[PDB]
Amino acid sequence: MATALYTANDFILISLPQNAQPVTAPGSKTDSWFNETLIGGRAFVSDFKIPEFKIG
């Protein structure tokens, strides 16, 4: 890049269905993909899972 400066860790939050599959890499699980495949393998993937509350 050069249209923006970053020098501090940036985050993207995703949520996906747990049955999902990437079509940029078929034959992969989403979790396995984040670590290995995603941006040259240099992605740090962190847990962010939360459970059910009570829905009206």
Next chain:
Amino acid sequence: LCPVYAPFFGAIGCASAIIFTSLGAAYGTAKSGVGICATCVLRPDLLFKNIVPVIMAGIIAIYGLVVSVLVCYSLGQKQALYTGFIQLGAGLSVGLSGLAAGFAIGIVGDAGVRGSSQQPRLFVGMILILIFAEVLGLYGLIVALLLNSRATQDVV
């Protein structure tokens, strides 16, 4: 047939090959530098990506330098007037066409680096238009080389 005032035209052809290509390259470098130094204040990461109009301007001055050196190494005191006329034509052919190529490179480069920070896809269009603008000086280089190849061919 080979008079005394004959290397005057060759000296003017050796001067005008580098003078007008340097004027064109100087217009291109000035316009593109005003563009870069106003578009890379906020986007400094693509500074070294935008120096390509300035390089395309400098290749025009290199084109003028090559023709001026080749005309310089064919001068002489007792040369023909035909040789002086061909060297004048070969100097003007590269000079006043590299001037136009430098005008085009400066205008296209300014307008392309001022808008390539907004749209990142415009860079491969700016490079493509600057190729057509630099082939304008390459044509004058080809005409100057083909003239200077015949400056001393069948000369008495």
